[PDB]
Amino acid sequence: AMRYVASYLLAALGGNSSPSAKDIKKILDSVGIEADDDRLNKVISELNGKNIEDVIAQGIGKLASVPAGG
């Protein structure tokens, strides 16, 4: 409900501290979660240049994009 932010965080947490769309596809592909190759490249595009832990260390929820209503 917050999009590929979390996948980005995962990749950056234990593989690559600057994840990309392909890394997202990777992470979600492993559990069979579908992803649009622009949507994640976009989330990453936003995410790129942030300190993952510190981001989520006060943001286990509403990761980057807060649920879009309407």
């Binding site: 409900a1 979390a6 492993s30 260390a57």
Partner: protein, 69 residues
């Protein structure tokens, strides 16, 4: 900050919540291995326990919500 393990389990659950798909220890483990970021295994267990009913926002509390010591 947290422990990247705990936080990793967090995120595995996060991706799981993006499709809101089934939550199993092996599911979270699959995320863990996919990214390459490992967790304190009791977390994947307890996560799979709770996240089938609770919300990821509960992880921010992690039945403690402590700051200093």
């Amino acid at each position: 900050m947290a422990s990247v393990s705990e936080l990793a389990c967090i995120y595995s659950a996060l991706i799981l919540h993006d499709d809101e798909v089934t939550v199993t220890e092996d599911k979270i483990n699959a995320l863990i291995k996919a990214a390459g970021v490992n967790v304190e295994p009791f977390w994947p267990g307890l996560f799979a326990k709770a996240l089938a009913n609770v919300n990821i926002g509960s992880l921010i509390c992690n039945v403690g919500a402590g700051g200093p010591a």
